[PDB]
Amino acid sequence: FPATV
Amino acid sequence: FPATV
Amino acid sequence: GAMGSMERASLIQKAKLAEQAERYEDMAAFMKGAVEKGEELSCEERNLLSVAYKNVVGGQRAAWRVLSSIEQKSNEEGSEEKGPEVREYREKVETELQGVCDTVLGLLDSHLIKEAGDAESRVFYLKMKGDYYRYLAEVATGDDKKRIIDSARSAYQEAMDISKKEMPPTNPIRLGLALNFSVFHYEIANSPEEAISLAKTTFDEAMADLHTLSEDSYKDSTLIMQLLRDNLTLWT
Amino acid sequence: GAMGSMERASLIQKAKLAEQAERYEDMAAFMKGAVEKGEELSCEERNLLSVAYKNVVGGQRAAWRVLSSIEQKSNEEGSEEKGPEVREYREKVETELQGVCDTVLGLLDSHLIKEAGDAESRVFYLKMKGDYYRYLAEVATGDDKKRIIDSARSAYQEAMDISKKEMPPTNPIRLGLALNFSVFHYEIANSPEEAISLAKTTFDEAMADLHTLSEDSYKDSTLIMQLLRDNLTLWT
Numbered sequence: 001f002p003a004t005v
Numbered sequence: 006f007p008a009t010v
Numbered sequence: 011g012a013m014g015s016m017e018r019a020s021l022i023q024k025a026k027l028a029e030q031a032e033r034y035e036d037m038a039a040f041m042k043g044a045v046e047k048g049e050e051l052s053c054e055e056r057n058l059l060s061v062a063y064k065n066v067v068g069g070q071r072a073a074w075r076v077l078s079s080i081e082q083k084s085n086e087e088g089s090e091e092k093g094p095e096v097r098e099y100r101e102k103v104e105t106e107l108q109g110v111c112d113t114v115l116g117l118l119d120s121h122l123i124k125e126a127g128d129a130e131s132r133v134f135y136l137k138m139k140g141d142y143y144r145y146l147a148e149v150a151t152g153d154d155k156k157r158i159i160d161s162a163r164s165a166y167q168e169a170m171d172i173s174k175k176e177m178p179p180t181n182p183i184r185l186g187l188a189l190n191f192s193v194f195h196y197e198i199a200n201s202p203e204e205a206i207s208l209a210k211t212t213f214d215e216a217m218a219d220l221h222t223l224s225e226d227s228y229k230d231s232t233l234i235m236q237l238l239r240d241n242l243t244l245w246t
Numbered sequence: 247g248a249m250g251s252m253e254r255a256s257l258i259q260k261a262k263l264a265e266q267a268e269r270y271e272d273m274a275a276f277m278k279g280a281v282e283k284g285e286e287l288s289c290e291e292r293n294l295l296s297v298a299y300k301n302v303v304g305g306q307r308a309a310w311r312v313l314s315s316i317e318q319k320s321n322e323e324g325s326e327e328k329g330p331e332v333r334e335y336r337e338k339v340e341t342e343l344q345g346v347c348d349t350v351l352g353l354l355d356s357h358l359i360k361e362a363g364d365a366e367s368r369v370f371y372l373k374m375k376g377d378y379y380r381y382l383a384e385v386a387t388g389d390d391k392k393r394i395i396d397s398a399r400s401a402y403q404e405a406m407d408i409s410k411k412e413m414p415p416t417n418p419i420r421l422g423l424a425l426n427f428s429v430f431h432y433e434i435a436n437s438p439e440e441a442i443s444l445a446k447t448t449f450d451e452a453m454a455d456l457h458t459l460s461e462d463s464y465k466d467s468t469l470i471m472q473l474l475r476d477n478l479t480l481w482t
């Protein structure tokens with residue numbers, strides 16, 4: 001999964 | 006801490 | 011509200027304790043109680059709120075993905091019927107996830123966003139609103155899925171418009187908003203080119219503004235820039 | 247029981263799904279529902295029950311330790327009074343922990359132990375009874391602390407007596423019981439010499455019986471023997 005903050 | 010199972 | 015009898019300051023203190031104890035459901039309950047006191051949140055308090063619910067919903071999302079994967083396999087050609095249990099339990103986790111999202115969205119709508127006038131608070135809350143509609147979108151399948159997606163898009167877009175007018179390109183809130191809106195484009199909106207364009211443009215505009223920053227601000231901004239690059243590497 | 251309307255087999259299936267999703271509170275609730283169907287548990291089912299509650303109470307214990315540590319520091323000479331909040335929140339976690347322990351002990355008393363006639367089930371359940379009284383002992387401070395300790399000791403002792411009569415020295419249940427009873431001696435009963443003696447004797451008697459085992463049984467037994475050695479290395 002891609003990075004999110 | 007010591008190991009327990 | 012079962013937190014209605016506790017002092018606001020005690021709720022914030024206990025949220026920090028719950029964080030140290032990795033008790034994020036408690037943390038979220040304490041911060042919900044703090045929000046419901048009705049006062050605006052400080053910068054630290056907004057981040058306590060976001061950390062708490064991000065951790066709670068993150069665990070729910072991970073569980074949902076495991077269960078959805080098992081469910082898909084049970085439905086492939088060749089599988090042995092295992093009955094309704096996988097679907098039922100995936101639905102149970104999904105409903106709990108939707109409940110948490112609805113709770114957070116409810117706090118933002120009553121009344122955090124409407125009282126948020128400064129860019130750092132308003133962009134932060136609108137980013138959260140996009141994020142939690144995005145999590146609802148991840149599990150949506152009904153008559154409402156397009157509308158959920160458009161609610162996420164609209165919140166992110168308003169946050170983006172404010173951030174480009176009111177914050178420097180290295181502001182970590184602006185960067186994190188762009189990171190997540192880019193993921194929305196890639197994973198939710200089936201717009202990988204928009205996702206890639208947004209991540210790249212955000213990264214390059216930030217790079218050109220790093221020279222203005224202190225060492226500590228530089229560290230904060232470059233951390234999120236590395237996440238943008240990480241996603242770009244994943245996608246190209 | 248909110249699980250009273252669900253099929254026993256569906257509860258067991260969902261416990262396994264909850265495990266795969268790392269949803270251990272759900273897992274424990276499903277296995278409590280299965281126990282409350284009133285039938286004896288198979289070997290696999292007993293381990294599902296133990297895995298679930300071990301994970302739940304393990305997290306509570308870790309949180310309690312963090313909070314107790316913060317509380318002790320707040321009470322040292324030189325600290326700034328931070329009010330009742332640390333104590334209150336430690337008490338909250340402690341009460342939830344005690345509730346989980348009481349729930350497990352209640353399942354063992356109604357009526358898992360009394361129906362357990364085979365050594366593998368009876369020793370397993372009495373070990374659990376010792377374990378959950380041990381967790382209660384870890385947080386106990388009142389008129390009842392000695393009695394809680396003696397309840398743990400008594401359950402472990404009955405399990406030990408059965409295991410030495412009815413199981414080989416390499417049986418992993420026998421080994422795990424001895425491991426944990428040894429930790430009880432060291433950490434709860436202030437009997438480090440008993441702890442060390444028990445771990446060493448258990449290890450040596452197991453070593454001498456490994457020659458009787460298949461490769462798969464050997465792997466299971468030597469894994470727990472390594473935990474015994476690990477503790478002995480910690481303590482000497």
Ligand SMILES: N=C(N)c1cc(-c2cccc(NC(=O)C3(Oc4ccc(Cl)cc4)CCCCC3)c2)cs1
Pocket residue numbers: 005029053054057058061134137182183185186187233234
């Ligand atoms: N956990 C607590 N007790 C407290 C946390 C804070 C706080 C205050 C300002 C900013 C951050 N930053 C962050 O958490 C991170 O960066 C963000 C987060 C969100 C966005 Cl929208 C953008 C970047 C999260 C991701 C990696 C880098 C750091 C934290 C005060 S108290």
Ligand SMILES: N=C(N)c1cc(-c2cccc(NC(=O)C3(Oc4ccc(Cl)cc4)CCCCC3)c2)cs1
Pocket residue numbers: 010265289290293294297370373418419421422423469470
């Ligand atoms: N998690 C599930 N779905 C299922 C687990 C089982 C199962 C059935 C028999 C035995 C074990 N063994 C264990 O879990 C371990 O060893 C023990 C545990 C307890 C004791 Cl009293 C002694 C040794 C735990 C500690 C390290 C080595 C392994 C598991 C069936 S299903």
